[PDB]
Design an enzyme around this catalytic site. Structure first.
Site, PDB file in Angstrom:
ATOM      1  N   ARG A 146       0.083   9.040   1.917  1.00  0.00           N
ATOM      2  CA  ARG A 146       0.076   8.967   3.381  1.00  0.00           C
ATOM      3  C   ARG A 146       0.821   7.918   4.043  1.00  0.00           C
ATOM      4  NH1 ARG A 146      -1.395   5.297   6.885  1.00  0.00           N
ATOM      5  NH2 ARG A 146      -3.154   6.575   7.771  1.00  0.00           N
ATOM      6  N   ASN A 147       1.558   7.073   3.400  1.00  0.00           N
ATOM      7  CA  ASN A 147       2.494   5.981   4.098  1.00  0.00           C
ATOM      8  C   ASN A 147       3.839   6.255   3.842  1.00  0.00           C
ATOM      9  OD1 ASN A 147       0.772   4.244   5.441  1.00  0.00           O
ATOM     10  ND2 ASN A 147       0.110   3.265   3.353  1.00  0.00           N
ATOM     11  N   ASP A 177       0.724  -1.429  -0.182  1.00  0.00           N
ATOM     12  CA  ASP A 177       0.089   0.011  -0.107  1.00  0.00           C
ATOM     13  C   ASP A 177       0.881   1.130  -0.074  1.00  0.00           C
ATOM     14  OD1 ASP A 177      -2.264   1.801  -0.160  1.00  0.00           O
ATOM     15  OD2 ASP A 177      -2.615   1.729   1.990  1.00  0.00           O
ATOM     16  N   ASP A 189       5.089   1.673   7.708  1.00  0.00           N
ATOM     17  CA  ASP A 189       4.168   0.641   7.570  1.00  0.00           C
ATOM     18  C   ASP A 189       4.314  -0.629   6.332  1.00  0.00           C
ATOM     19  OD1 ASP A 189       1.044   2.156   8.654  1.00  0.00           O
ATOM     20  OD2 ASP A 189       2.762   1.604   9.755  1.00  0.00           O
TER      21      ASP A 189
END
Ligand code: VVW
Length: 290
Positions: A155-156, A151, A169
């Site tokens: 945002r990560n 993913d 993450d």
């Protein structure tokens, strides 16, 4: 859980602070994370279970811990600092990224009249390129350790006080056989918009699936934190991807960068660049613009 002396950190050397987000992540002060400076304070982030946690949640956090032990250290990932496994709740202690995630970093720095600098926003093209280059370097490192993120998205990617990009993450159990493709997050994100078509349609993930997601991330960077496939709900996304739809070139985005985006979204995974190639292509641009 057994004691691993390489990583165990005394939990009484942590002072937990305000939560960051949701396991759950909380900021903390750590004393003596460097054993040579045992009274020195540092700020870290602590991953831990939620109150409502199931045994599956615990196994997932243990698995992320174990992945992070094996991944090793790199400048452009969130690195494991220590763990607390004995005589109390499980904590996984990682680097804290003081400017938050890259999407919110970019959205808060979009361009704007007193003074001589009124038109000048905080973001410049070379710094955007550097953000993309640093993410590609992080992903090249993760790939070399056989880690597929699954993913990758702005945002990560987290941003430090010195504007270093750190992939976060990456070591997670993502439930890939039970994704709710219509899921919208509390901030309005539709994570299906980052999935490569082989992942979405065929449940196949490779490092080249992360390259597709990197192309989406590049588009997020050069829209200063825009949301992908503007205005397109999930049902329409599925039909458009079957037809080979790709996003348009963003405003004020040079063709070198849109060209890279489109290479990352080639239908055949083998026709997408590798992370090694993306690192090289972005370094050429970055060096040219200094
Ligand atoms: C510690 O350096 C720190 N960190 C932050 N923000 C932050 O996000 N740190 C962070 C989060 C994180 O994972 C979480 C779940 C996350 C979040 Cl919250 C959002 N998107 C993605 C993810 Cl994956 C990891 C990991 N692994 C590591 N680090 C912080 O913040 C401040 C508030 N703010 C800043 C950005 O704009 C919006 C919100 C603050 C700090 C430490 N600092 C610095 C400044 N002082 C004054 C206060 C403070 O606590």
């Amino acid at each position: 859980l057994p004691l691993d002396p390489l990583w165990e950190f005394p939990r009484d050397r942590l002072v937990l602070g305000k939560p960051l987000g949701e396991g759950q992540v909380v900021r903390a002060e750590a004393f003596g994370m460097d054993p040579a400076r045992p009274d020195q304070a540092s700020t870290v982030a602590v991953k831990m279970l939620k109150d409502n946690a199931s045994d599956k949640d615990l196994a997932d956090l243990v698995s992320e811990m174990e992945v992070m032990k094996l991944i090793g250290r790199h400048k452009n990932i969130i690195n494991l600092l220590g763990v607390c496994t004995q005589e109390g709740p499980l904590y996984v202690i990682v680097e804290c990224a003081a400017k938050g995630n890259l999407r919110e970093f970019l959205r808060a720095r979009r361009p704007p009249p007193d003074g001589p600098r009124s038109s000048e926003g905080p973001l410049s093209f070379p710094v955007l390129v550097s953000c993309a280059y640093q993410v590609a370097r992080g992903m090249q490192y993760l790939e070399s350790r056989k880690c597929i993120h699954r993913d990758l998205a702005a945002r990560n990617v987290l941003v430090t006080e010195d504007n270093v990009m750190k992939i976060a993450d990456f070591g997670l159990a993502r439930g890939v056989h039970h994704i709710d493709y219509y899921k919208k997050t509390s901030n309005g994100r539709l994570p299906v918009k980052w999935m490569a078509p082989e992942a979405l349609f065929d449940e196949v993930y490779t490092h080249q699936s992360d390259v597709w997601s990197f192309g989406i991330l590049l588009w997020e960077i050069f829209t200063l934190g825009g949301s992908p496939y503007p205005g397109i709900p999930v049902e329409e996304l599925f039909s458009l991807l079957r037809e080979g739809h790709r996003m348009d070139r963003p405003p004020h985005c040079p063709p070198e960068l849109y060209g890279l985006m489109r290479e990352c979204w080639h239908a055949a995974p083998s026709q997408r660049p590798t992370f090694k190639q993306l690192v090289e292509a972005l370094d050429k641009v970055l060096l040219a613009v200094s």
